[PDB]
């Protein structure tokens, strides 16, 4: 595992707000990076950069980005409670979806259904193909929904909040969680499903929790609870190595690679000078981009 | 330069 990233991209004006999900790597190998009020696209193949959009009103900022599975549309959540849908090949906003009462800090796609999480605590399902996009409201959080992730098989949706809860929702309704994990003693932003085990979920808590928890969402069992000694902003699973990677803050501002299922520490990726905000994985699974409050995106080819 |  290389101790240095393969690339370092400048991320000037990246919002140092823990609850936002400002980066996402598309299946088309394009990294979407939200920098204050703009979204930049960076093609990992050509290095071409495109300023896709800029918010039009003063005080507006991007609070989340998420690529649809095919990588041709980008969802962008805003501080003005909008969930915009951008066609990145046309470089045009197809939709400006309103329904939320507060910023949309988290997003996750399940086919044509886009789920959005808000600072209000609500999650909305949006059928982006239809006029009345708002087809469901999932209300299981009383504070900001900062983690939102559909399972790769679409059978469950996980959400983590600033109310220290993890909810595991069904894919259809009523709309009540199948599981509500209260064991994290801090905000739950890190939420990632095991790619090779349908019901296995990894979650990570903030500064007052510092733990990575592995769950079986069917039995509700906590399979593992590991102290990372720092806030856990993000978790990713490598489908190739059978490992997890987590991003952290004070004091080391590092990424940790853990062996699964033993949860043994494999490596620490040091380099960021301020807290890591988000991790995102390349489509091939080889590279992890970490966005940090030090205004850089470090691209670690740690799984190749 | 953003992302440079």
Author numbering:
A (entry chain A): 168 to 340, 344 to 474
B (entry chain B): 2 to 5
The authors write:
Here we explore peptide inhibitors of Cdc20, a substrate-recognition subunit and activator of the E3 ubiquitin ligase the anaphase-promoting complex/cyclosome (APC/C) that is essential in mitosis and consequently of interest as an anti-cancer target. APC/C engages substrates via degrons that include the ‘destruction box’ (D-box) motif. The D-box binding site comprises a cleft between two of the beta-propeller blades and the neighbouring APC/C subunit APC10, which is thought to result in stabilisation of the active complex. We used a rational design approach to construct binders containing unnatural amino acids aimed at better filling a hydrophobic pocket that contributes to the D-box binding site on the surface of Cdc20.
We incorporated (S)–2-amino-4,4-dimethylpentanoic acid (C3) into the backbone sequences of D4, D10, and D19 replacing leucine at position 4, yielding peptides D7, D12, and D20, respectively. As expected, the structure–activity relationship (SAR) held true between all peptides, whereby incorporation of the unnatural amino acid increased the binding affinity over 6-fold versus the respective parental peptide. We attempted these soaking experiments with our four highest affinity peptides, D21, D20, D7, and D19 (in order of highest affinity to lowest) and were able to observe sufficient ligand density for all but D19. The crystal structures of Cdc20WD40 in complex with each of the other three D-box peptides show that they bound to Cdc20WD40 at the canonical D-box degron binding site, with a largely similar topology to the S. cerevisiae Acm1-Cdh1 structure (overlay of D21 with Acm1 D-box). The nitrogen backbone atom of the (S)–2-amino-4,4,4-trifluorobutanoic acid/(S)–2-amino-4,4-dimethylpentanoic acid unnatural amino acids also forms a hydrogen bond with the carbonyl of Asp177. All peptides form a hydrogen bond between the carbonyl of A2 to the amine of G5/S5. Interestingly, the observed electron density of the peptide correlates with Cdc20 binding affinity: D21 and D20, having the highest affinities, display the clearest electron density allowing six amino acids to be modelled, whereas D7 shows relatively poor density permitting modelling of only four residues. We then explored whether the D-box peptides at a fixed concentration stabilise the Cdc20, and for D7, D20, and D21 we observed increases in the thermal stability of Cdc20 that correlated with their binding affinities as previously determined.
